[PDB]
Design a protein around this ligand. Structure first.
Ligand SMILES: Nc1ncnc2c1ncn2[C@@H]1O[C@H](COP(=O)(O)OP(=O)(O)O)[C@@H](O)[C@H]1O
Ligand SMILES: [Mn+2]
Length: 426
């Protein structure tokens, strides 16, 4: 598609080839062959470990280093951002290639934002590879094989009858769901109808991707995690086109209700099928898309990260409209950024929560923030009693944090791990 000079400082090349085009398995190994030939220092950003592992098989290259005397470094989107949180490492590359570059994960937004910023200042060349570049997006893009798309009502939880087309189907299905909890209700119903199911989400995906290929379940019930390069080997997608909606409301992060997926997400979920020439696959969907995701906390988290990996940076191109504050707003001091980093990489904190804690709390060892918040911030077990725990001096605390992020207590995180932190054990 691009001959040469794509590696010239300040060249931003968007590889918006349709899904299954060969971006990951064909195009990428060719771009690395070139970069090694012309002896250019190259960074390749994969979205997840699964994709990273699959690049590691595709690239038996003697000048390639995989992160967890070679001139090509391959790491995850998150690894690149997280290392730049130490003013210490901050190694440089002339060529950056970012795979699955549509991802709205705050680390991905931040990464492509930083890289865009460098290339706009001619410190490097940037390749973004994705079926659905930020900007204009189409819900039914081209595929390697035909897809029959049809709108039908889709169950939003358990069901008994009237959706026989679900169970009567003869091949393997991927069913996208907005949340782990909704996932659990769909899965339980399918199993009661004698179908095999594997669930995939933020929690299970790095571990359980592999089982799909190995076990060939009737159904994969998956969150939006499978939108960044998973090959589920299915002939049908069911897609209610909803997503969970993490949003900062009244100084707290809430996880209630759903939003409609962006057109990019709808495209990517459809994109799990239609990957093979000479077979028709189905995409069953309900309702329409909504590209205005500007309300989500992800933009603010992206700025938190971007503001702390620069020393004026923007998000990539169109996404700049969605940066919630003026660049730099979230920049921490060096000492506080260290605390921030530790909370992210060692305590599993969301960037939102890690920033509030790091910016506001006196010392790295204080835990009293986790019990001194307003009463309305107290965290309940699903059995309705408020969570309690013991500080090291044996004092009984009610978990009641100053900064309340609903993500720390469900959707793939457990109260138990936050209690470990709050009680000073971690
Ligand atoms: N070992 C393999 N791994 C992944 N895709 C493969 C493999 N062998 C063949 N393919 C084909 O590669 C195509 C998708 O390539 P990929 O690089 O993943 O596309 P894109 O990144 O543009 O979505 C499909 O036609 C798929 O069948
Ligand atoms: Mn790809």
């Amino acid at each position: 598609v691009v001959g040469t000079g794509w590696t010239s400082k300040g060249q931003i090349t968007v590889l918006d080839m349709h899904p299954g085009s060969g971006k990951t398995h064909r195009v990428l190994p060719e771009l690395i062959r070139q970069c090694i030939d012309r002896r250019l220092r190259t960074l390749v950003l994969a979205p997840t470990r699964v994709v990273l592992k699959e690049m590691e098989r595709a690239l038996n290259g003697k000048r390639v280093r995989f992160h967890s005397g070679a001139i090509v470094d391959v790491m995850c989107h998150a690894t690149y951002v997280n290392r730049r949180l130490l003013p210490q490492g901050r190694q440089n590359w002339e060529v950056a290639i970012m795979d699955e570059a549509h991802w709205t994960d705050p680390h991905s937004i931040a990464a492509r934002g930083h890289l865009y910023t460098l290339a706009k200042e001619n410190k490097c060349a940037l390749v973004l590879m994705t079926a659905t570049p930020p900007g204009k997006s189409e819900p039914f893009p081209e595929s390697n094989g035909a897809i029959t798309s049809e709108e039908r009502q889709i169950p939003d939880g358990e069901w008994r009858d009237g959706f026989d087309w679900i169970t009567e189907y003869e091949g393997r299905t991927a069913w996208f769901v907005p949340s782990i909890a909704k996932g659990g209700a769909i899965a339980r119903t399918l199993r009661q109808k004698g179908k095999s199911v594997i669930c995939l989400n933020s929690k299970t995906f790095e571990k359980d991707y592999s089982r799909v290929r190995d076990e060939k379940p009737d159904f994969v019930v998956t969150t939006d995690i499978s939108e960044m390069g998973a090959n589920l080997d299915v002939s049908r997608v069911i897609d209610g086109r909803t997503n969970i909606k993490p949003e900062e409301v009244d100084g707290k992060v809430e996880l209630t209700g759903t939003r409609r997926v962006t057109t990019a997400s709808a495209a990517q979920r459809r994109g799990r099928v239609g990957r093979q020439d000479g077979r028709t696959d189905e995409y069953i969907y309900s309702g329409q898309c909504d590209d205005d995701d500007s309300g989500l906390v992800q933009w603010k988290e992206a700025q938190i990260l971007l503001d702390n990996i620069t020393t004026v940076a923007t998000f990539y191109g169109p996404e700049q409209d969605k940066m919630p504050e003026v660049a730099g707003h979230f920049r921490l001091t060096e000492e506080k950024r260290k605390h921030f980093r530790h909370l992210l990489t060692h305590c599993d904190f969301t960037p939102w929560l890690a920033w509030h804690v790091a910016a506001n709390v006196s010392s790295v060892t204080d835990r009293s923030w986790t019990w001194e918040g307003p009463e309305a911030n107290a965290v309940d077990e699903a059995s309705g009693d408020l969570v309690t725990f013991r500080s090291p001096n044996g004092a009984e605390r009610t978990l009641r944090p100053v900064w309340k992020d609903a993500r720390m207590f469900k959707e793939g995180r457990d109260i138990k791990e936050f209690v470990a932190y709050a009680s000073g054990r971690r």
